[PDB]
Amino acid sequence: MKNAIVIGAGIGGLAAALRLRHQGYSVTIFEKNDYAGGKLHAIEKDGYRFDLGPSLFTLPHLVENLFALFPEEIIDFGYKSKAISFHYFWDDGTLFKASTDSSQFIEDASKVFKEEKSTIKKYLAKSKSKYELTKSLFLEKSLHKATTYFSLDTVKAIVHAPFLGLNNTLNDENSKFKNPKLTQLFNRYATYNGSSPYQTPGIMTMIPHLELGLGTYYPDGGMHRISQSLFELAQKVGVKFRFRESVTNITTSKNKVTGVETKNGSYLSDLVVSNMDIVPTYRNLMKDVPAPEKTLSQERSSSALIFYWGIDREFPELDLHNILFSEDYKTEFEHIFEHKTLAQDPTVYINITSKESSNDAPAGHENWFVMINAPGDYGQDWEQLVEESKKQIIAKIKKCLHVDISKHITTEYILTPQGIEKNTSSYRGALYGAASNNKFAAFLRHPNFNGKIKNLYHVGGSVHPGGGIPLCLLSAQITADLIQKEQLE
Numbered sequence: 001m002k003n004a005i006v007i008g009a010g011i012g013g014l015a016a017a018l019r020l021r022h023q024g025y026s027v028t029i030f031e032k033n034d035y036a037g038g039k040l041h042a043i044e045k046d047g048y049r050f051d052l053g054p055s056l057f058t059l060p061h062l063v064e065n066l067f068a069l070f071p072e073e074i075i076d077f078g079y080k081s082k083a084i085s086f087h088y089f090w091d092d093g094t095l096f097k098a099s100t101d102s103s104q105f106i107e108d109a110s111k112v113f114k115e116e117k118s119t120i121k122k123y124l125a126k127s128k129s130k131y132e133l134t135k136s137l138f139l140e141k142s143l144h145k146a147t148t149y150f151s152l153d154t155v156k157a158i159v160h161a162p163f164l165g166l167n168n169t170l171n172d173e174n175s176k177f178k179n180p181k182l183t184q185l186f187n188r189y190a191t192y193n194g195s196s197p198y199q200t201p202g203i204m205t206m207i208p209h210l211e212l213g214l215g216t217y218y219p220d221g222g223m224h225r226i227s228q229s230l231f232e233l234a235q236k237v238g239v240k241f242r243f244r245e246s247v248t249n250i251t252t253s254k255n256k257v258t259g260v261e262t263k264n265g266s267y268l269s270d271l272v273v274s275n276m277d278i279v280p281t282y283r284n285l286m287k288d289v290p291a292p293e294k295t296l297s298q299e300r301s302s303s304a305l306i307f308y309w310g311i312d313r314e315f316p317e318l319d320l321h322n323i324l325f326s327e328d329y330k331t332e333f334e335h336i337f338e339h340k341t342l343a344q345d346p347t348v349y350i351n352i353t354s355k356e357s358s359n360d361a362p363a364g365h366e367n368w369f370v371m372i373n374a375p376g377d378y379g380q381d382w383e384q385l386v387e388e389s390k391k392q393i394i395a396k397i398k399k400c401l402h403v404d405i406s407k408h409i410t411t412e413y414i415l416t417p418q419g420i421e422k423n424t425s426s427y428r429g430a431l432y433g434a435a436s437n438n439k440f441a442a443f444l445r446h447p448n449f450n451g452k453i454k455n456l457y458h459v460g461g462s463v464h465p466g467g468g469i470p471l472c473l474l475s476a477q478i479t480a481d482l483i484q485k486e487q488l489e
């Protein structure tokens with residue numbers, strides 16, 4: 001039986017390992033940290049639990065597909081569907097509580113924004129058709145097509161560009177709404193891959209379909225249960241783990257992978273699958289191999305700055321997912337992507353899992369995950385940025401919720417783009433690999449195979465097909481399909 005080594009226990013690596021296991025490989029995952037899940041990590045601090053990374057759960061069938069590979073194993077993983085997606089607030093007092101029932105969303109949005117129902121209806125149906133077309137056409141495509149060098153392979157993208165909105169920006173399509181608050185609400189979806197609504201293509205209007213047509217869910221135990229259930233499953237089906245052991249080099253011979261090295265020794269495998277960020281994969285682990293320099297130089301997605309606050313009271317106006325919109329979104333993104341700094345009026349996301357699992361906070365308290373969009377680390381003075389952002393975020397919460405939250409903070413943890421970078425070796429602290437700030441960027445990501453080194457594969461959020469849970473999971477599926485194909489040949 002052949003063996004595979006997976007470099008990193010992120011969601012992509014865990015998924016890949018599970019798939020290779022199902023195929024019959026023996027599998028070992030190396031992890032630099034003393035925990036599994038990478039960005040899907042959690043902490044418990046002074047009476048509060050916090051998810052550290054992903055907070056939004058859509059497309060739960062993609063996780064279930066992994067359990068389905070091992071129908072006999074007993075893994076407790078469940079989730080519920082929510083009636084409400086997000087609460088949205090603005091400085092002028094406007095609040096929109098957004099239903100996951102599309103009929104109710106359209107009616108509510110119509111009244112709250114004084115906007116024609118037909119406009120909202122047509123937009124959501126177009127968002128749906130975009131998703132289904134993109135899924136059918138690009139995410140379900142077969143792997144028949146092969147070759148010795150890199151290729152574009154998407155005349156279909158050009159056929160369908162007018163319908164998908166590939167030649168305009170997200171904001172071009174979102175500016176159809178008359179109320180600018182509604183334009184803003186839908187421009188927010190550019191953050192779902194760390195891009196700007198003013199640059200990312202119009203195909204991204206499909207993103208709200210995920211949470212508004214397909215459901216918004218909450219897993220039992222919070223988001224941490226996603227990586228941990230998968231870790232538990234992996235361990236039960238025989239995947240081996242080497243924790244606190246960073247891979248330092250990927251070994252080859254005669255242009256085929258032979259295994260990896262760590263500070264502790266060398267290990268051989270028939271296959272290597274890296275779940276490490278593609279930049280240090282080349283820069284650090286393949287120092288003797290020629291790097292695809294343009295791929296590695298693609299613009300980096302945005303990062304984040306997060307404050308985790310225990311809060312000594314309740315806010316009945318807040319649900320699980322809440323947004324306090326900046327009064328000037330265009331400036332917000334300009335700072336982030338053009339100047340690598342922070343605008344003074346931020347869009348603040350407040351996530352509160354204690355609304356779903358009351359054990360996540362003391363009785364009558366809340367566990368606030370408080371996040372603003374942020375540039376990656378390019379040498380800024382992060383100490384000053386954090387100090388400044390804190391005061392602006394507190395100012396934002398006074399404008400929108402009419403409370404001085406500083407009187408209620410009982411404990412604080414902070415995560416910056418430096419912390420993000422250190423935690424998981426994500427280059428620049430970018431949350432989603434390369435940004436998607438033009439129509440080529442998706443088609444310019446590193447593939448899941450490697451054209452120089454046979455039997456070396458790549459999985460996760462910095463490579464094809466993209467950042468975020470659903471796409472990282474597809475990364476692993478595609479990687480495993482490739483390998484099975486190669487076996488058959």
Ligand SMILES: Cc1cc2nc3c(=O)[nH]c(=O)nc-3n(C[C@H](O)[C@H](O)[C@H](O)COP(=O)(O)OP(=O)(O)OC[C@H]3O[C@@H](n4cnc5c(N)ncnc54)[C@H](O)[C@@H]3O)c2cc1C
Pocket residue numbers: 007008009010011012013030031032033036037038039040052053054055056057245246247248275276277304306420423424425426431432459460461462467468469470472
């Ligand atoms: C704050 C935040 C919020 C987010 N929210 C969302 C969300 O709501 N929805 C969403 O879809 N996505 C979200 N994301 C993004 C999402 O978390 C990632 O894109 C995705 O989970 C990353 O998966 P991955 O497979 O790339 O693995 P990663 O999570 O990046 O982890 C990779 C693993 O590899 C390990 N590793 C690296 N180098 C080595 C080495 N040399 N040796 C051994 N091990 C190594 C790392 O330590 C890490 O454990 C969020 C990200 C952040 C930071």
